[PDB]
PDB file of C-alpha atoms and ligand atoms in Angstrom:
ATOM      1  CA  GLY Y   1      64.870   5.401 -72.380  1.00  0.00           C
ATOM      2  CA  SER Y   2      62.584   5.705 -75.460  1.00  0.00           C
ATOM      3  CA  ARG Y   3      62.742   8.133 -78.818  1.00  0.00           C
ATOM      4  CA  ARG Y   4      59.454   9.939 -79.821  1.00  0.00           C
ATOM      5  CA  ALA Y   5      57.642   8.969 -82.659  1.00  0.00           C
ATOM      6  CA  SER Y   6      54.632   9.853 -84.368  1.00  0.00           C
ATOM      7  CA  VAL Y   7      52.228   6.980 -85.103  1.00  0.00           C
ATOM      8  CA  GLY Y   8      49.292   6.950 -87.285  1.00  0.00           C
ATOM      9  CA  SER Y   9      48.002   5.808 -90.494  1.00  0.00           C
ATOM     10  CA  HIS Y  10      49.519   6.996 -94.454  1.00  0.00           C
ATOM     11  CA  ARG Y  11      47.823  10.532 -95.846  1.00  0.00           C
ATOM     12  CA  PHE Y  12      49.098  10.245 -99.242  1.00  0.00           C
ATOM     13  CA  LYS Y  13      48.129  13.116-101.589  1.00  0.00           C
ATOM     14  CA  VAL Y  14      49.841  13.504-105.309  1.00  0.00           C
ATOM     15  CA  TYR Y  15      52.843  14.393-105.683  1.00  0.00           C
ATOM     16  CA  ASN Y  16      54.932  16.650-108.508  1.00  0.00           C
ATOM     17  CA  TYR Y  17      58.259  14.377-108.422  1.00  0.00           C
ATOM     18  CA  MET Y  18      61.072  16.669-109.799  1.00  0.00           C
ATOM     19  CA  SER Y  19      63.904  14.249-110.877  1.00  0.00           C
ATOM     20  CA  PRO Y  20      62.820  10.411-111.146  1.00  0.00           C
ATOM     21  CA  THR Y  21      61.496   8.940-108.221  1.00  0.00           C
ATOM     22  CA  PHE Y  22      61.055   5.037-107.357  1.00  0.00           C
ATOM     23  CA  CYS Y  23      58.376   3.366-105.929  1.00  0.00           C
ATOM     24  CA  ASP Y  24      58.850   3.136-102.162  1.00  0.00           C
ATOM     25  CA  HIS Y  25      56.947  -0.260-102.297  1.00  0.00           C
ATOM     26  CA  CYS Y  26      57.490  -2.251-105.326  1.00  0.00           C
ATOM     27  CA  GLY Y  27      60.883  -0.531-106.724  1.00  0.00           C
ATOM     28  CA  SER Y  28      59.547   0.587-110.345  1.00  0.00           C
ATOM     29  CA  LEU Y  29      59.925   4.016-111.562  1.00  0.00           C
ATOM     30  CA  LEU Y  30      56.822   6.613-111.071  1.00  0.00           C
ATOM     31  CA  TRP Y  31      56.220   6.474-114.305  1.00  0.00           C
ATOM     32  CA  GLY Y  32      56.314  10.336-115.834  1.00  0.00           C
ATOM     33  CA  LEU Y  33      57.393  13.944-115.584  1.00  0.00           C
ATOM     34  CA  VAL Y  34      54.221  15.506-113.178  1.00  0.00           C
ATOM     35  CA  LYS Y  35      51.677  13.480-110.837  1.00  0.00           C
ATOM     36  CA  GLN Y  36      54.132  10.391-110.582  1.00  0.00           C
ATOM     37  CA  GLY Y  37      52.631   9.048-107.794  1.00  0.00           C
ATOM     38  CA  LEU Y  38      51.675  10.172-104.046  1.00  0.00           C
ATOM     39  CA  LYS Y  39      53.629  10.541-101.507  1.00  0.00           C
ATOM     40  CA  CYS Y  40      52.561  10.645 -97.568  1.00  0.00           C
ATOM     41  CA  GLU Y  41      52.177  13.841 -96.059  1.00  0.00           C
ATOM     42  CA  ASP Y  42      53.596  12.697 -92.656  1.00  0.00           C
ATOM     43  CA  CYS Y  43      56.312  10.557 -93.566  1.00  0.00           C
ATOM     44  CA  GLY Y  44      57.396  10.865 -97.127  1.00  0.00           C
ATOM     45  CA  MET Y  45      56.909   7.220 -98.195  1.00  0.00           C
ATOM     46  CA  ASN Y  46      56.053   7.624-102.201  1.00  0.00           C
ATOM     47  CA  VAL Y  47      54.159   4.928-104.026  1.00  0.00           C
ATOM     48  CA  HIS Y  48      52.084   4.295-107.109  1.00  0.00           C
ATOM     49  CA  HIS Y  49      48.515   5.023-107.122  1.00  0.00           C
ATOM     50  CA  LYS Y  50      48.216   0.983-107.666  1.00  0.00           C
ATOM     51  CA  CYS Y  51      50.420   0.672-104.478  1.00  0.00           C
ATOM     52  CA  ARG Y  52      48.661   2.523-102.072  1.00  0.00           C
ATOM     53  CA  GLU Y  53      46.262  -0.284-102.135  1.00  0.00           C
ATOM     54  CA  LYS Y  54      49.306  -2.848-101.103  1.00  0.00           C
ATOM     55  CA  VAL Y  55      51.378  -0.828 -98.522  1.00  0.00           C
ATOM     56  CA  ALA Y  56      50.491  -1.184 -94.567  1.00  0.00           C
ATOM     57  CA  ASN Y  57      49.054   1.844 -93.013  1.00  0.00           C
ATOM     58  CA  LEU Y  58      50.821   2.094 -90.835  1.00  0.00           C
ATOM     59  CA  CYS Y  59      53.165   5.643 -90.442  1.00  0.00           C
ATOM     60  CA  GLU Y  60      55.635   6.066 -87.871  1.00  0.00           C
ATOM     61  CA  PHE Y  61      58.269   8.555 -87.696  1.00  0.00           C
ATOM     62  CA  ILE Y  62      60.924   9.778 -85.259  1.00  0.00           C
ATOM     63  CA  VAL Y  63      60.424  13.272 -84.376  1.00  0.00           C
ATOM     64  CA  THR Y  64      63.665  14.831 -84.065  1.00  0.00           C
ATOM     65  CA  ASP Y  65      62.415  18.372 -82.726  1.00  0.00           C
TER      66      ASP Y  65
ATOM     67  CA  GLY D   1      21.225   1.089-114.856  1.00  0.00           C
ATOM     68  CA  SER D   2      23.600   2.390-111.769  1.00  0.00           C
ATOM     69  CA  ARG D   3      24.466   5.384-109.936  1.00  0.00           C
ATOM     70  CA  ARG D   4      28.242   6.971-110.027  1.00  0.00           C
ATOM     71  CA  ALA D   5      29.470   6.467-106.800  1.00  0.00           C
ATOM     72  CA  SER D   6      33.170   8.021-105.572  1.00  0.00           C
ATOM     73  CA  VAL D   7      34.159   4.825-103.681  1.00  0.00           C
ATOM     74  CA  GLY D   8      37.692   4.692-101.317  1.00  0.00           C
ATOM     75  CA  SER D   9      38.553   5.236 -97.832  1.00  0.00           C
ATOM     76  CA  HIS D  10      37.391   8.268 -95.607  1.00  0.00           C
ATOM     77  CA  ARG D  11      40.286  11.400 -95.423  1.00  0.00           C
ATOM     78  CA  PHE D  12      39.521  12.300 -91.774  1.00  0.00           C
ATOM     79  CA  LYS D  13      40.897  16.042 -90.980  1.00  0.00           C
ATOM     80  CA  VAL D  14      40.525  17.880 -87.342  1.00  0.00           C
ATOM     81  CA  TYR D  15      37.803  20.513 -87.687  1.00  0.00           C
ATOM     82  CA  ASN D  16      36.969  22.975 -85.781  1.00  0.00           C
ATOM     83  CA  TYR D  17      32.742  22.883 -85.687  1.00  0.00           C
ATOM     84  CA  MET D  18      30.868  25.936 -84.920  1.00  0.00           C
ATOM     85  CA  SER D  19      27.917  24.865 -83.601  1.00  0.00           C
ATOM     86  CA  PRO D  20      26.818  21.861 -82.035  1.00  0.00           C
ATOM     87  CA  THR D  21      27.384  18.497 -83.712  1.00  0.00           C
ATOM     88  CA  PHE D  22      27.295  14.879 -82.788  1.00  0.00           C
ATOM     89  CA  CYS D  23      29.503  11.746 -83.681  1.00  0.00           C
ATOM     90  CA  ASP D  24      28.285   9.922 -86.630  1.00  0.00           C
ATOM     91  CA  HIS D  25      29.674   7.466 -85.094  1.00  0.00           C
ATOM     92  CA  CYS D  26      28.233   6.609 -81.550  1.00  0.00           C
ATOM     93  CA  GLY D  27      25.984   9.906 -81.230  1.00  0.00           C
ATOM     94  CA  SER D  28      27.420  11.571 -78.464  1.00  0.00           C
ATOM     95  CA  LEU D  29      28.216  15.518 -78.870  1.00  0.00           C
ATOM     96  CA  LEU D  30      31.714  16.446 -80.345  1.00  0.00           C
ATOM     97  CA  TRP D  31      32.692  18.593 -76.858  1.00  0.00           C
ATOM     98  CA  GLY D  32      34.672  21.320 -76.971  1.00  0.00           C
ATOM     99  CA  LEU D  33      34.573  25.002 -78.945  1.00  0.00           C
ATOM    100  CA  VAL D  34      37.901  23.887 -81.100  1.00  0.00           C
ATOM    101  CA  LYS D  35      39.283  21.178 -82.920  1.00  0.00           C
ATOM    102  CA  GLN D  36      36.156  18.957 -81.280  1.00  0.00           C
ATOM    103  CA  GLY D  37      36.328  15.800 -83.811  1.00  0.00           C
ATOM    104  CA  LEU D  38      37.127  15.183 -87.578  1.00  0.00           C
ATOM    105  CA  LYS D  39      35.271  15.708 -90.836  1.00  0.00           C
ATOM    106  CA  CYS D  40      35.999  13.168 -93.526  1.00  0.00           C
ATOM    107  CA  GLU D  41      37.009  15.691 -96.532  1.00  0.00           C
ATOM    108  CA  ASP D  42      35.261  13.126 -99.230  1.00  0.00           C
ATOM    109  CA  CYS D  43      32.052  11.838 -97.301  1.00  0.00           C
ATOM    110  CA  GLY D  44      31.599  14.626 -94.522  1.00  0.00           C
ATOM    111  CA  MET D  45      31.342  12.290 -91.675  1.00  0.00           C
ATOM    112  CA  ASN D  46      31.925  13.463 -88.320  1.00  0.00           C
ATOM    113  CA  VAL D  47      33.855  11.662 -85.707  1.00  0.00           C
ATOM    114  CA  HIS D  48      35.324  12.082 -83.032  1.00  0.00           C
ATOM    115  CA  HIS D  49      38.938  11.787 -82.524  1.00  0.00           C
ATOM    116  CA  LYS D  50      38.481   8.038 -80.311  1.00  0.00           C
ATOM    117  CA  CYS D  51      35.939   6.881 -82.651  1.00  0.00           C
ATOM    118  CA  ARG D  52      38.180   7.226 -85.787  1.00  0.00           C
ATOM    119  CA  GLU D  53      39.638   3.656 -85.100  1.00  0.00           C
ATOM    120  CA  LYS D  54      35.703   2.654 -84.355  1.00  0.00           C
ATOM    121  CA  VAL D  55      34.470   3.526 -88.047  1.00  0.00           C
ATOM    122  CA  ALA D  56      34.844   1.071 -91.325  1.00  0.00           C
ATOM    123  CA  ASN D  57      37.896   2.892 -93.833  1.00  0.00           C
ATOM    124  CA  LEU D  58      34.757   2.447 -96.632  1.00  0.00           C
ATOM    125  CA  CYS D  59      33.941   6.194 -97.892  1.00  0.00           C
ATOM    126  CA  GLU D  60      31.342   6.506-100.236  1.00  0.00           C
ATOM    127  CA  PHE D  61      29.327   9.147-101.915  1.00  0.00           C
ATOM    128  CA  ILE D  62      27.059   9.827-104.545  1.00  0.00           C
ATOM    129  CA  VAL D  63      28.482  12.131-107.383  1.00  0.00           C
ATOM    130  CA  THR D  64      25.309  14.367-108.447  1.00  0.00           C
ATOM    131  CA  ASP D  65      27.550  16.633-110.737  1.00  0.00           C
TER     132      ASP D  65
HETATM  133 ZN1   ZN R 101      53.018   7.945 -93.994  1.00  0.00          ZN
HETATM  134 ZN1   ZN R 102      54.919   0.590-106.910  1.00  0.00          ZN
HETATM  135 ZN1   ZN R 103      34.656   9.646 -95.890  1.00  0.00          ZN
HETATM  136 ZN1   ZN R 104      32.301   8.894 -81.365  1.00  0.00          ZN
END
């Protein structure tokens, strides 16, 4: 048997974090109070702009519907 | 002297074409009457779903602003 996963590549979009949030790639704070980084519209990964260049494209999440 | 170019990776989104449109990668018609393919939100490239993985990610266009 298997889980069902949605599989593709990340779809990052600038996001306004309402509380202090860290980069899921490098571990440093997403600096500032607005537009601090990007959140993947599909899986929720949060990254610095500069870290968008560093993460693997692979984007998967379990469809728990 | 240098053109100003916007340089990134493609941002493909499923698109509902209103008139017969060809794949910018392979040259075959984007078949169907809805969701026939994907259009890059940045540069306008049109591709079949199956051709998305065949094209280079590089996405550039001249900024004529
Ligand atoms: Zn993702
Ligand atoms: Zn980072
Ligand atoms: Zn493009
Ligand atoms: Zn094609």
